[PDB]
Scaffold this active site. Structure first.
Site, mmCIF file in Angstrom:
data_model
loop_
_atom_site.group_PDB
_atom_site.id
_atom_site.type_symbol
_atom_site.label_atom_id
_atom_site.label_comp_id
_atom_site.label_asym_id
_atom_site.label_seq_id
_atom_site.Cartn_x
_atom_site.Cartn_y
_atom_site.Cartn_z
ATOM 1 N N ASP A 1 -70.042 106.968 -12.174
ATOM 2 C CA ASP A 1 -69.775 105.685 -11.889
ATOM 3 C C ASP A 1 -70.845 104.801 -12.235
ATOM 4 O O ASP A 1 -70.860 103.559 -12.356
ATOM 5 C CB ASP A 1 -69.306 105.248 -10.294
ATOM 6 C CG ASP A 1 -70.439 105.777 -9.447
ATOM 7 O OD1 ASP A 1 -71.310 106.596 -9.714
ATOM 8 O OD2 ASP A 1 -70.315 105.145 -8.465
ATOM 9 N N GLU A 2 -72.092 105.618 -12.354
ATOM 10 C CA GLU A 2 -73.273 105.021 -12.895
ATOM 11 C C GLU A 2 -73.251 104.258 -14.136
ATOM 12 O O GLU A 2 -74.184 103.567 -14.569
ATOM 13 C CB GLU A 2 -74.722 105.950 -12.501
ATOM 14 C CG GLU A 2 -74.408 106.354 -11.076
ATOM 15 C CD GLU A 2 -75.540 107.464 -10.919
ATOM 16 O OE1 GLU A 2 -76.912 107.236 -11.389
ATOM 17 O OE2 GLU A 2 -75.538 108.143 -10.034
ATOM 18 N N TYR B 1 -80.506 108.723 -17.059
ATOM 19 C CA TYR B 1 -79.392 109.628 -16.741
ATOM 20 C C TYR B 1 -78.274 109.072 -16.928
ATOM 21 O O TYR B 1 -77.289 109.446 -17.753
ATOM 22 C CB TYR B 1 -79.449 110.131 -15.184
ATOM 23 C CG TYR B 1 -77.901 110.458 -14.690
ATOM 24 C CD1 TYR B 1 -77.597 111.706 -15.301
ATOM 25 C CD2 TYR B 1 -77.569 109.891 -13.734
ATOM 26 C CE1 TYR B 1 -76.230 112.060 -14.876
ATOM 27 C CE2 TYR B 1 -76.094 110.305 -13.270
ATOM 28 C CZ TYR B 1 -75.683 111.315 -13.733
ATOM 29 O OH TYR B 1 -74.434 111.788 -13.386
ATOM 30 N N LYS C 1 -75.187 109.480 -19.702
ATOM 31 C CA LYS C 1 -73.800 109.714 -19.529
ATOM 32 C C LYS C 1 -73.089 108.889 -20.164
ATOM 33 O O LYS C 1 -71.650 108.994 -20.656
ATOM 34 C CB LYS C 1 -73.514 109.665 -18.112
ATOM 35 C CG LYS C 1 -74.126 111.072 -17.131
ATOM 36 C CD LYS C 1 -73.420 112.394 -17.563
ATOM 37 C CE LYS C 1 -71.902 112.214 -17.365
ATOM 38 N NZ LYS C 1 -71.571 113.657 -17.644
HETATM 39 N N1 LIG Z 1 -73.261 114.735 -8.322
HETATM 40 C C1 LIG Z 1 -72.738 113.694 -8.471
HETATM 41 O O1 LIG Z 1 -72.487 112.789 -7.245
HETATM 42 C C2 LIG Z 1 -71.720 113.151 -9.510
HETATM 43 C C3 LIG Z 1 -71.058 111.928 -9.376
HETATM 44 C C4 LIG Z 1 -70.263 111.407 -10.558
HETATM 45 C C5 LIG Z 1 -70.265 112.129 -11.885
HETATM 46 N N2 LIG Z 1 -70.999 113.514 -11.795
HETATM 47 C C6 LIG Z 1 -70.959 114.280 -12.916
HETATM 48 O O2 LIG Z 1 -70.285 115.414 -12.666
HETATM 49 C C7 LIG Z 1 -70.729 116.564 -13.502
HETATM 50 C C8 LIG Z 1 -71.276 117.580 -12.564
HETATM 51 O O3 LIG Z 1 -72.196 117.065 -11.674
HETATM 52 P P1 LIG Z 1 -72.931 117.916 -10.505
HETATM 53 O O4 LIG Z 1 -73.486 117.262 -9.533
HETATM 54 O O5 LIG Z 1 -72.273 118.953 -10.031
HETATM 55 O O6 LIG Z 1 -74.289 118.726 -11.437
HETATM 56 P P2 LIG Z 1 -75.066 119.724 -10.999
HETATM 57 O O7 LIG Z 1 -76.630 119.305 -11.263
HETATM 58 O O8 LIG Z 1 -75.048 120.286 -9.785
HETATM 59 O O9 LIG Z 1 -74.981 120.907 -12.228
HETATM 60 C C9 LIG Z 1 -75.042 120.798 -13.361
HETATM 61 C C10 LIG Z 1 -74.414 122.088 -13.921
HETATM 62 O O10 LIG Z 1 -74.328 122.007 -15.480
HETATM 63 C C11 LIG Z 1 -75.155 123.080 -15.950
HETATM 64 N N3 LIG Z 1 -75.840 122.900 -17.117
HETATM 65 C C12 LIG Z 1 -76.962 121.997 -17.631
HETATM 66 N N4 LIG Z 1 -77.199 121.732 -18.565
HETATM 67 C C13 LIG Z 1 -76.201 122.861 -19.452
HETATM 68 C C14 LIG Z 1 -76.128 123.052 -20.751
HETATM 69 N N5 LIG Z 1 -76.827 122.663 -21.780
HETATM 70 N N6 LIG Z 1 -74.932 123.832 -21.105
HETATM 71 C C15 LIG Z 1 -74.378 124.630 -20.208
HETATM 72 N N7 LIG Z 1 -74.432 124.214 -19.058
HETATM 73 C C16 LIG Z 1 -75.508 123.429 -18.172
HETATM 74 C C17 LIG Z 1 -76.011 123.438 -14.892
HETATM 75 O O11 LIG Z 1 -76.532 124.981 -15.083
HETATM 76 C C18 LIG Z 1 -75.263 123.243 -13.420
HETATM 77 O O12 LIG Z 1 -74.413 124.530 -13.297
HETATM 78 C C19 LIG Z 1 -71.832 115.947 -14.288
HETATM 79 O O13 LIG Z 1 -71.240 115.706 -15.708
HETATM 80 C C20 LIG Z 1 -72.280 114.712 -13.581
HETATM 81 O O14 LIG Z 1 -72.643 113.576 -14.407
HETATM 82 C C21 LIG Z 1 -71.884 113.974 -10.717
HETATM 83 C C1 LIG Z 2 -83.118 111.812 -3.705
HETATM 84 C C2 LIG Z 2 -83.432 110.696 -2.785
HETATM 85 C C3 LIG Z 2 -82.333 109.610 -3.227
HETATM 86 N N1 LIG Z 2 -82.528 108.357 -2.217
HETATM 87 C C4 LIG Z 2 -81.184 107.452 -2.381
HETATM 88 C C5 LIG Z 2 -81.445 106.925 -3.872
HETATM 89 C C6 LIG Z 2 -79.658 106.307 -4.006
HETATM 90 O O1 LIG Z 2 -79.677 105.102 -3.573
HETATM 91 C C7 LIG Z 2 -79.305 107.435 -3.089
HETATM 92 C C8 LIG Z 2 -78.688 108.522 -3.670
HETATM 93 O O2 LIG Z 2 -79.480 109.039 -4.533
HETATM 94 P P1 LIG Z 2 -79.038 110.422 -5.299
HETATM 95 O O3 LIG Z 2 -78.788 111.643 -4.522
HETATM 96 O O4 LIG Z 2 -80.216 110.872 -6.088
HETATM 97 O O5 LIG Z 2 -77.736 110.102 -6.016
HETATM 98 P P2 LIG Z 2 -77.850 108.997 -7.247
HETATM 99 O O6 LIG Z 2 -78.948 108.564 -7.832
HETATM 100 O O7 LIG Z 2 -76.691 109.458 -8.391
HETATM 101 O O8 LIG Z 2 -76.631 107.878 -6.448
HETATM 102 O O9 LIG Z 2 -80.347 107.987 -2.049
HETATM 103 C C9 LIG Z 2 -83.466 108.242 -1.255
HETATM 104 O O10 LIG Z 2 -83.715 107.357 -0.468
HETATM 105 N N2 LIG Z 2 -84.403 109.232 -1.282
HETATM 106 C C10 LIG Z 2 -84.486 110.556 -1.809
HETATM 107 O O11 LIG Z 2 -85.186 111.419 -1.546
#
Ligand SMILES: NC(=O)c1ccc[n+]([C@@H]2O[C@H](COP(=O)([O-])OP(=O)(O)OC[C@H]3O[C@@H](n4cnc5c(N)ncnc54)[C@H](O)[C@@H]3O)[C@@H](O)[C@H]2O)c1
Ligand SMILES: Cc1cn([C@H]2C[C@H](O)[C@@H](COP(=O)(O)OP(=O)(O)O)O2)c(=O)[nH]c1=O
Ligand SMILES: NC(=O)c1ccc[n+]([C@@H]2O[C@H](COP(=O)([O-])OP(=O)(O)OC[C@H]3O[C@@H](n4cnc5c(N)ncnc54)[C@H](O)[C@@H]3O)[C@@H](O)[C@H]2O)c1
Ligand SMILES: Cc1cn([C@H]2C[C@H](O)[C@@H](COP(=O)(O)OP(=O)(O)O)O2)c(=O)[nH]c1=O
Lengths: 361, 361
Positions: free
Chosen positions: B134-135, B167, B171
């Site tokens: 959503d970012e 980031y 995306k």
């Molecule tokens: N974490 C969130 O709240 C969130 C929210 C919305 C969307 N997303 C999206 O969801 C997807 C997964 O997010 P996540 O939180 O599970 O990430 P994550 O950081 O937990 O995991 C990333 C994964 O991708 C792999 N990776 C990184 N570079 C790579 C490469 N070059 N080739 C193959 N594998 C590679 C890593 O080894 C790891 O297993 C992403 O595309 C992210 O942008 C995440």
């Molecule tokens: C990692 C981190 C995030 N945050 C805040 C920033 C964001 O508003 C929220 C979630 O951050 P984060 O987990 O990094 O997720 P995203 O940036 O994708 O939303 O928490 C802190 O206040 N302290 C921390 O140490």
């Protein structure tokens, strides 16, 4: 002011450089990799100026770009370097990802580090002007898709991005990097998105210059699909004036669409060029007989139209040419510059023509 | 159905893989580079299944990815591989440009060539599901910026892209490439953009897992700014269910926002975690005493909120957890999985902590 310009040996870039040297007191350092589209001949009229310096380099070469910034100490950056042809992006997208996205990233990092270390004064006045395109906005409804009474929408600075081709997706991405660097690091950036450009020193792969040269050489004038697609045409010298105004007076963090509100259908533009040539360089038959319909471009955007209201009311910019006056100046320019035209037509150019046009789709 | 999944060894990716093996008849080939974020231990529950196969590879390695596509002959692709931490992107953006943008491009090209050579049947049913965030939509007006009566806007599938960080810009760029490949080449792609995820197997660098673990280790709970920033929290297992529904029933060329309409202020989430720990693992003082206000994140987006109306009415998806039920399950999961935590935490992790938190801004 010292302006660092990337892609200054290109079509729009050379117009910007020529304008700065000829009509302003600013200085210029031109960084250009000289790809198939780079041409130092387009800068022949100002290359000897003590206010102009050329650096043959790739924006991806971080070490060299870093060194250049430190040597010239620019007060502003105008970033025009890019792979610009949609058709080349369809068959060879890699160069667009590399130059347009990664290259902008590389340049932004050099600019960020440079800007961050500047003195209070210079740091506050520094500007990073990213030159972009209206294509990042995607396609607009076409006149033949709506009621002959409803007002057609135009691209505004708040129109959502929706790029259709690898080229436009690459530019949209570069725009995002520029704005994110502004929001995250505070870098004083400005983004401009302009409509199609045409005029002197245009590389013969875009519609207008390709049609003019093919017409004169007795070759076919390739019309993609029905040629009812619409483009907004801005004379390159008008774009150049707008760009110098933006880098000088534009506000950091703002976006400015640039265009002259000149929507035209492709076929109409071709007929206009043909009639101009029938008049200026008449021959046994009309150049119109060379008009040839060919397979359409994959994912072709059918209509671009820019609303330049913002730059008009905020900076007071207005185009000096009309499409009528500009297209005539363009045809006249190519007829008067066969030297430039013969040099830019190498075996490489011929290879592209064969690749994109012979046995086409 | 054979599903090729990238980034399946990560947080959301592992949840997707576990869900598919445990609750469906589909098979999986997991491609993961195993960066600091990829841990095979997150897939221990299903690593032995004959319906699961792991390939240790980088999506940028075209030659290897091509070979994998040909060997497994996937019916669909679910692309989750990426660098996902905003804070890491601020100090080390290169990895994001490389993996998120260039990597997506590299994967799209392998998939395109694969898809183009497929038989009529398999070619029409193929699907390339791009998982996003959503970012890409940027920031939304915050409650303290508008009248206490006006309704706050939400992110919809037509909201304009306006990424704030390296980031999110990375995306947003990957999203454009996916849609451009669809418009230009016909590749049947689907894009999903979800709110913040939280839950089991979350790497300890994101807000919730970092706070839970730091609390239990007697360390500070770092709040950026005043902690009044807002995020929309969706349990990771709910996201996983939605994703499989999308790749299976989603319509090519469509975009689906995913979220549970759970806006929460960061500080409130931290207090909720502290209250849970005060209850489950009580000590001499409240865990709240470890809360510390630190320098704000540069370019920090103050409010994210997803409108999941479309996926709800079109696919019928609904989250099963409430934030209350999900956050308790998350706290309980970390308390019961110290082994996983210790296996994922390493010397590099502490280096990141020192880099981002000690002597912070
Ligand atoms: N974490 C969130 O709240 C969130 C929210 C919305 C969307 N997303 C999206 O969801 C997807 C997964 O997010 P996540 O939180 O599970 O990430 P994550 O950081 O937990 O995991 C990333 C994964 O991708 C792999 N990776 C990184 N570079 C790579 C490469 N070059 N080739 C193959 N594998 C590679 C890593 O080894 C790891 O297993 C992403 O595309 C992210 O942008 C995440
Ligand atoms: C990692 C981190 C995030 N945050 C805040 C920033 C964001 O508003 C929220 C979630 O951050 P984060 O987990 O990094 O997720 P995203 O940036 O994708 O939303 O928490 C802190 O206040 N302290 C921390 O140490
Ligand atoms: N032509 C148009 O109608 C139009 C319309 C809107 C926006 N734009 C944008 O305006 C800018 C200039 O467009 P143009 O038509 O003049 O392009 P062009 O094709 O005529 O010239 C590109 C120039 O950039 C240089 N270049 C390419 N890759 C480089 C690299 N890696 N490092 C350094 N220099 C490199 C080339 O050598 C060349 O001089 C681009 O960013 C383009 O996207 C063009
Ligand atoms: C190059 C070319 C373009 N066109 C069309 C496609 C576009 O609608 C229009 C302008 O194309 P082009 O010059 O490639 O510019 P852009 O794609 O950035 O707008 O002319 C042709 O019909 N034939 C050609 O040979």
């Amino acid at each position: 002011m010292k302006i660092l310009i990337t892609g200054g040996a290109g079509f729009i870039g050379s117009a910007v450089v020529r304008h700065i040297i000829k009509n302003t007191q600013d200085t210029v350092v031109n960084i250009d990799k000289l790809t198939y589209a780079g041409n130092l001949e387009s800068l022949s009229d100002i290359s000897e100026s003590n206010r102009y310096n050329f650096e043959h380099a790739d924006i991806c070469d971080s070490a060299e770009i870093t060194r250049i910034f430190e040597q010239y100490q620019p007060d502003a950056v105008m970033h025009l370097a890019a792979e610009s042809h949609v058709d080349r992006s369809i068959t060879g997208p890699a160069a667009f990802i590399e130059t347009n996205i990664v290259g902008t990233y590389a340049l932004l990092e050099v600019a960020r580090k440079y800007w961050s270390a500047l003195g209070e004064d210079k740091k506050n006045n520094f500007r990073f002007h990213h030159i972009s395109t209206d294509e990042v906005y995607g396609d607009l409804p076409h006149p033949d898709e709506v009621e002959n009474s409803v007002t057609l929408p135009l691209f505004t600075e708040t129109t959502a991005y929706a790029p259709s081709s690898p080229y436009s997706a690459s530019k949209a991405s570069s725009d995002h990097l520029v704005r994110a660097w502004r929001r995250t690091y505070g870098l004083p950036t400005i983004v401009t998105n302009c409509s199609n450009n045409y005029g002197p020193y245009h590389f013969p792969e875009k519609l207008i210059p390709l049609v003019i040269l093919n017409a004169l050489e007795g070759k076919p004038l390739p019309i993609y699909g029905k040629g009812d697609q619409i483009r907004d045409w801005l004379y390159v010298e008008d774009h150049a004036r707008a760009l110098h105004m933006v880098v000088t007076e534009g506000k950091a963090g703002e976006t400015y669409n640039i265009g002259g509100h000149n929507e035209k259908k492709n076929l109409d533009v071709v007929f206009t060029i043909c009639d101009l040539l029938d008049e200026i360089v008449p021959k046994a038959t009309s150049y119109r007989e060379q008009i040839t319909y060919v397979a359409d471009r994959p994912g072709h955007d059918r209509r671009y139209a820019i609303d330049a209201g913002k730059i008009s009311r905020e900076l007071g910019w207005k185009p000096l040419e009309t499409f009528e006056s500009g297209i005539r100046k363009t045809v006249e320019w190519y007829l008067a510059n066969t030297q430039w035209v013969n040099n830019v037509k190498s075996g490489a150019y011929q290879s592209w023509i064969e690749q994109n046009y012979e046995g086409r789709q």
